[PDB]
Amino acid sequence: GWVRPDLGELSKVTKVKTDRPLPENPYHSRARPEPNPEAEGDLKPAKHGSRLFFWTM
């Protein structure tokens, strides 16, 4: 009864109904580092300006 596959059928991506659970951490990854805290708040002008030496602005 064996029909021979046509051109392109054997190259298809198919799906398989497996019973195996999906691996959780296939890379055996460490915990990722905590990120640097983000920037919050509204911009206020520099207190007393640049404060570079004798400059007042």
């Binding site: 640097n36 805290p37 207190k47």
Partner: protein, 63 residues
């Protein structure tokens, strides 16, 4: 003008000069800590962007 005005103006001058000295010392300290530890917005040197990694299935399974 009266002595009061020079007195008060000296007071305001001294206040903001002292706050500027305090801010300058605090800025120096924050700079030292940020450059030593890298946990602040400053001295953030670039690492590779992880969106450049291709996660598509490769020709071989173990990668």
């Amino acid at each position: 003008d009266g002595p009061e005005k020079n007195y008060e103006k000296t007071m305001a001058i001294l206040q903001i000069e002292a706050e500027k000295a305090e801010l300058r010392l605090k800025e120096l300290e924050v700079r030292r800590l940020m450059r030593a530890r890298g946990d602040g917005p400053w001295y953030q040197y670039p690492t590779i962007d992880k969106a450049l990694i291709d996660h598509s299935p490769k020709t071989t399974p173990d990668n």
